[PDB]
Design a binder for this molecule. Structure first.
Ligand SMILES: NC(=O)c1ccc[n+]([C@@H]2O[C@H](COP(=O)([O-])OP(=O)(O)OC[C@H]3O[C@@H](n4cnc5c(N)ncnc54)[C@H](OP(=O)(O)O)[C@@H]3O)[C@@H](O)[C@H]2O)c1
Ligand SMILES: NC(=O)c1ccc[n+]([C@@H]2O[C@H](COP(=O)([O-])OP(=O)(O)OC[C@H]3O[C@@H](n4cnc5c(N)ncnc54)[C@H](OP(=O)(O)O)[C@@H]3O)[C@@H](O)[C@H]2O)c1
Ligand SMILES: NC(=O)c1ccc[n+]([C@@H]2O[C@H](COP(=O)([O-])OP(=O)(O)OC[C@H]3O[C@@H](n4cnc5c(N)ncnc54)[C@H](OP(=O)(O)O)[C@@H]3O)[C@@H](O)[C@H]2O)c1
Ligand SMILES: *OC(*)(*)(*)(=O)[C][C](*)C(*)(*)(=[N])[C@](*)([O])=O*
Ligand SMILES: *OC(*)(*)(*)(=O)[C][C](*)C(*)(*)(=[N])[C@](*)([O])=O*
Ligand SMILES: *OC(*)(*)(*)(=O)[C][C](*)C(*)(*)(=[N])[C@](*)([O])=O*
Lengths: 459, 459, 459
């Protein structure tokens, strides 16, 4: 062996493995232990130097990656992250999670992830273009519409997807669904920008309906969100549409919180969206209207929103991994939070998860805080990417209503699958909510493990 | 020339050619003689050594084949056979037949067939895995989703399809519809397991309705089936569903016959299915319940079912080529059999066909035994494979009801095409049933010949 | 950034960088600092899961790697290591070193390295075969005669090269010089087995001639060697041929030392070679003749040879990285050792190198211990691999005398280049031997950096 330390990956692996062990899965199918050992080593990883030219004519060097984790269920599928933290450990945690998330969508998509330690912050659009051109010059050897289909993630938006697609088409001389999150006129899907955030909210609608026996909904609930990028923006918009209140957003430098009762409006979210297109911080817009209104908004530098929002009903971490600590989880519980779903991949620390799950086991019915893992709740994005692939393969574009209806059905089925799987393999005490994390993990893992066995990846 | 003796291929060719000559086709289009000469030489054949390792560590050698017969109408399409009889002659008869069968489906599929003289009987699942891995290591150079799309046949089930698909994906680094008969979670189609047997029964429903002017159906009819694999199992299930009685199944070692009035049940077929998954003989299950009940079941070693079932209304040979002799055909006629359709490819000997066709010409209307050739009646399997290809290209999965409805429409159109083509080119005496073998052959051949001419394969 | 800890790679990088800084190179060409930053990030790295079947039928999982570090001077070139220590850090140190080593040969070869954490010890030949088959099934996508040409290294012999070549030819359907160290009848080169060890000794012949003004040679010198594989065996044979005494060999479990005056003989080396073919330890042969003769041989469990050989004139570490500690370096100096050359890649710890170099600076002429780095002294192996590539591209085989003559010329030129480059850029005090490590590093680095600039890798 002599294996390197990969803490993020180890964290994701340990949480999956623990939930599988804490169930009857390996009593019924002890041979799945072998499947777990095999699935946890990626099929392929490509790492590559990316040399690019800055606006001053200087040579810059970054590291590029694509983790092609598992392809039993379909071609490798998952986003690209451009963030200075990026390394193999991080991309492996993401790619591993992606395998099981993709399994929960019901579409034929394997799991992968890639990106670079290139930091889009402080770069010109021209610099981003030159970087994407160099990056894809190498990546295009390894991907393709029936091989590996990337998309965005942190630091990769429609702008970067465009520069990447352009360079792929130029070298490969094929116009195909090699990327998703593409633009409307060049093979994009309606609802793809909305999909992840909408899906998180759709999934939580099912959680609320089940836990409260149809008595409550998002109508009148206070929802704390973190991040202010793609997932946070559209989760906020859907909450607002359903009559809920969005009481926080955040970024890497601080939190922007609603002061008292009230909500972000669609118009305010659009202004924040335009700020983030320009790669600027929330801190840069709080000096002018409307965000300078200290009666509506409180900007807190260096803080996450969880301890500053007061009473809340729903928390949707939608920024990055490990953004809810164990302490923060306890404060959310103390604030009356009954629903927590990950928009962000591995948004909760392990301490947070353990806190939420202990609370669920100790508190009957609607009194419990119910935790839904990202692989279930944030699967709407990759699901709609699958639909974008389907549209590109049909050579036709579907309506917003058609894509959105399918997204709703996928999120419903994903919730049902996790709920019913937990009821079957990790049956809770009477009156206790089944574990959506355990259920989702078992449901995704078994589907992958069985397909791997069929295909001779293990025996 | 100096051509080798290929008896099976020569048989299939001669029967097609004879039916074309015994019609007005070459009076109207004498240039189609040229088309016949060209179509009868395969576009490409690949043969290859397959070295594989047995459970004792010993080197084993088998022969692999893929016959890519014709691609005018679409990429090459047809199954893989693993049986110790396999050779080029056999695979050419099958691939030749496949061209015209595929033409009758209305889908864009060319004709091919392949396989190996590897005998799955007596092998471990591990040995089957190692064999499929070695086999596909070579075959993957020659096939692909827009080139050649294999599937199962005798000795190749979903298990083997899985091992084959896995190895293809590993080498080719593409996840695509390169095989059909795939598993549910990795690009399979609902109704594909059922398709061939269901389709045979659907086709015969049309034969019964036409011959009897709507007065009879499968309800209350006695149906003798041979084989006990994929085609026989599902043909039996559909018969049962329509209110018919299944009075025989068989395998390579003997026949299992219903003793008197009665039928196999769905539960019994499932037990036989599980036996065949384990690659065991019917002889191995007649020593225990329910098949040890000598009042319901008679096991006859070394026999085909035809002379042992007594009176029957419908015969569906569903095992292998040349499994109804001339003598057996006469006994079926003497037993009151009025409908005979091939589930198996070239199930009837030429003597049998001649006997059935002479009887049709000598006996008006419903008094005739009506013979339907495999290229018409068993086309449901490859049709649903085409639909599996369509689903994989759409990147979506259809419902059981959707696939089954399309299968029903395809079988109806295939019957109508053969019936109407025979009425046009080989017009029977008044009151005489048109020849479905002649009609089907002309309809499939002309479609292929005309497409070949358009594409410059002949002029 | 967020880069992982890669100690071996960092060690190799730091030693190169330090020698470049401790010279006039960056005074003359400060722009080469940019070249250093670019060259130190590999062009491409492929990592992949390797699933293989053991003799009991169980699924085994190992990790495979190919580091394609630099291709300015030619296609990527360097060995494969199968050892349980293997990871990316180790393969990056090796691949980095390979760039500059290959530059010193005068042949068009870029730098790479690969392998697996698969441990050949305790495996059957059948298990090694199945592993090599699985390994190359993936690796063959990334390599080729004009792309990347691997070879052996620790744990990869002609046996493994054969299984690897066979699988490549099977999938890729090309017979070409994709590997070196091939067998005599299937594209191997005479002198390739000998090349690394012979070359180390040839290089040291030049060191001795220069330091002693032609007065001494290997004739009558005592030479301590470590390892007992390919490099150690043939270095020992060449020493013996030149009239030197070989006074030690070793393996991972202990050292086999000559007791007093005397030498290993060719016959004894052949017996050790046959033992190592069988993957057995030196410990397993000391219980029988000739190695049980305690008057000729002392086996010391758990020891390296350096402190146990007494007085020695030349040390040739030929096993593995970091196998001469700082303390061991001082004992060799105290034992009269005047020449130390690395057969093994990064054989000396940094402490050892610093000790040897301090001694050289403090002691005039022949009184100094003279250290030659592996990139200079062990380059004969990869040089003869280049010649094997040349022979395969010519489609002809050269004589032993032709290959050996070219190897001698390459080792002479490599020595001259390092010596003269050190005299130019790191001029020693009068009477002090120039630094072969500094000279070799500058000569290899500048050639690569300049070719990279020409090709637009940096500007
Ligand atoms: N996009 C998708 O379809 C999709 C699908 C499923 C899951 N996800 C997950 O959802 C999360 C958000 O992704 P996104 O697509 O919304 O990305 P995005 O548009 O780049 O937004 C990321 C947001 O999170 C913040 N953030 C990122 N890294 C951070 C760090 N290390 N510390 C603190 N804050 C950080 C950003 O702050 P700054 O504004 O300061 O840069 C920004 O507000 C990620 O975990 C992602 O993997 C995304
Ligand atoms: N599967 C398809 O979709 C498809 C489509 C169209 C036509 N067909 C045709 O349908 C027939 C049956 O195929 P299948 O898919 O059902 O195969 P299968 O599942 O392997 O079953 C074949 C059955 O036929 C018996 N059999 C095979 N070779 C024989 C021989 N040489 N002598 C006596 N009995 C033999 C087998 O006996 P044992 O059990 O003793 O092995 C078994 O009961 C074949 O002619 C095939 O080409 C198949
Ligand atoms: N082969 C080439 O052409 C070539 C060219 C240039 C440089 N090199 C370098 O030369 C050195 C030897 O390679 P080789 O081709 O001779 O390999 P080899 O035939 O496998 O022999 C390696 C020898 O070193 C010992 N060894 C390996 N790893 C060890 C460890 N971690 N600790 C202690 N002892 C260890 C082995 O002991 P066991 O017998 O106990 O296994 C064996 O005696 C390596 O540094 C290699 O990279 C090789
Ligand atoms: O492929 C995709 O659409 C990726 C979506 C995403 N960034 C995720 O699931 O983490
Ligand atoms: O391609 C297929 O689905 C083949 C079906 C079959 N075995 C046949 O038509 O003979
Ligand atoms: O490519 C080769 O011949 C590699 C030789 C070697 N193992 C080295 O230089 O480390």
């Amino acid at each position: 062996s002599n294996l390197p330390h990969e803490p993020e990956f180890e964290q994701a692996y340990k949480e999956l493995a623990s939930t599988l062990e804490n169930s009857t899965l390996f009593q019924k199918n002890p041979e799945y232990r072998k499947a777990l050992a095999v699935v946890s080593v990626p099929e392929r990883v490509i790492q590559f130097r990316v040399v690019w030219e800055d606006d001053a004519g200087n040579v810059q060097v970054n590291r590029g990656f694509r983790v092609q984790f598992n392809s039993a269920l379909g071609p490798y599928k998952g986003g690209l992250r451009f963030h200075p933290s990026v390394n193999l450990s991080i991309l492996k945690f993401l790619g591993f999670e992606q395998i099981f998330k993709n399994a929960l969508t019901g579409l034929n998509m394997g799991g992968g992830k890639g990106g670079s330690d290139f930091d889009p912050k402080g770069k010109s659009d021209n610099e981003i273009r030159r970087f994407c051109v160099s990056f894809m010059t190498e990546l295009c050897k390894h991907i393709g519409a029936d091989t590996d289909v990337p998309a965005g993630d942190i630091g990769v938006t429609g702008r970067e997807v465009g520069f990447l697609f352009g360079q792929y088409r130029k070298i490969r001389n094929q116009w195909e669904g090699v990327l998703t999150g593409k633009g409307g006129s060049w093979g994009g899907s309606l609802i793809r920008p909305e999909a992840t955030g909408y899906g998180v909210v759709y999934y939580v609608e099912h959680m609320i309906a089940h836990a409260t026996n149809g008595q409550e909904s998002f109508k009148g609930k206070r929802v704390a969100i973190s991040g202010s990028g793609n997932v946070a923006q559209y989760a906020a918009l859907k909450v607002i549409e359903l009559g809920g209140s969005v009481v926080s957003l955040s970024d890497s430098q601080g939190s922007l919180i609603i002061n008292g009762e009230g909500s972000f409006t669609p118009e305010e979210i659009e202004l924040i969206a335009q700020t983030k297109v320009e790669r600027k911080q929330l801190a840069s817009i709080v000096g002018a209207a409307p965000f300078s209104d200290a009666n509506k908004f409180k900007y807190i530098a260096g803080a996450r929103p969880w301890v500053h929002v007061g009473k809340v009903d729903v928390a949707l971490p939608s920024a990055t991994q490990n953004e809810i600590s164990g302490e923060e989880a306890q404060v959310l519980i103390n604030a009356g939070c009954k629903f927590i779903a990950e928009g962000s991949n591995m948004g909760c620390t392990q301490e947070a998860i353990d806190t939420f799950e202990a609370h669920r086991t100790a508190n009957a019915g609607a009194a419990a805080i119910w935790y839904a893992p990202g692989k279930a709740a944030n699967a709407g994005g990759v699901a709609v990417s699958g639909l974008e692939m389907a549209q590109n393969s049909a050579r036709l574009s579907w309506t917003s209503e058609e894509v959105d209806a399918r997204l709703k059905d996928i999120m419903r089925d994903c919730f049902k699958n996790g709920l019913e799987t937990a009821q079957e393999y990790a049956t809770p005490a009477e009156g206790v909510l089944p574990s959506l994390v355990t259920g989702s993990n078992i449901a995704g893992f078994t589907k992958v493990a069985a397909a791997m066995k069929d295909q001779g990846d293990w025996w």
